[PDB]
């Protein structure tokens, strides 16, 4: 499978999430995603085929994980945006006020701005702290997907949102959306990952 940020993958033939970013740890191929998507050694599949297993994760507290892939996988420095792609250039953290987009298998590519940092989400399982809030919309399925500026700076991975009964927060004004994501840098240094860039 070509590993592109934003595409669907299943965890143990059951939940769905979206790929955040192609990374490497030494000779190992991987991708960052959300911690709540799978437990360590859960099987990721992309299009029926097994692509890898959860190597590590932290959820709740944080919401982060990486999936080590079999070497058959083709890591790519892109994030899906319809039939187009955004090249991943680096991981400079953008500031509040900045415009940012996100990609996932449910709502596709959506943009908005970063509204606040260091938010605590109080999920049913426990608090997850240090999340950044943006107001681009998202839906169930989008977790783990890429948040990225149009200039190609990888920001993070989808954690959670204020979901309405249609499974997403795209039918309410941006002013009311609280879409939260886990910052990429801490995940990257914590697992000793290097982001694939183009």
């Amino acid at each position: 499978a070509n590993i592109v940020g934003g595409i669907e993958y299943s965890i143990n033939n059951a939940s769905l999430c979206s790929v955040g970013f192609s990374v490497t740890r030494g000779a190992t191929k991987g991708f960052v995603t959300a911690g709540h998507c799978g437990t360590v050694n859960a099987t990721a599949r992309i299009g029926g085929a097994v692509v890898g297993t959860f190597a590590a994760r932290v959820f709740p507290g944080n919401d982060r994980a990486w999936v080590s892939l079999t070497s058959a996988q083709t890591l790519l420095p892109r994030v899906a945006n319809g039939s187009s792609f955004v090249t991943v250039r680096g991981s400079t953290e953008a500031a509040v006020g900045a415009a940012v987009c996100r990609s996932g298998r449910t709502t596709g590519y959506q943009c908005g701005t970063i509204t606040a940092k260091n938010v605590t989400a109080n999920y049913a399982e426990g608090a997850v702290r240090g999340l950044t809030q943006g107001n681009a919309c998202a839906g169930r399925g989008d977790s783990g997907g890429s948040w990225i500026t149009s200039a190609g700076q990888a920001q993070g991975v989808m954690s959670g949102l204020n979901v309405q009964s249609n499974g997403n927060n795209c039918g309410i004004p941006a002013s009311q959306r609280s879409s939260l994501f886990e910052r990429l840098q801490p995940i990257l240094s914590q697992y000793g990952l290097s982001l694939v860039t183009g």
Binding site: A34, D63, S143, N162
Partner: peptide, 4 residues
């Protein structure tokens, strides 16, 4: 907010 709910995780996903």
């Amino acid at each position: 907010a709910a995780p996903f």
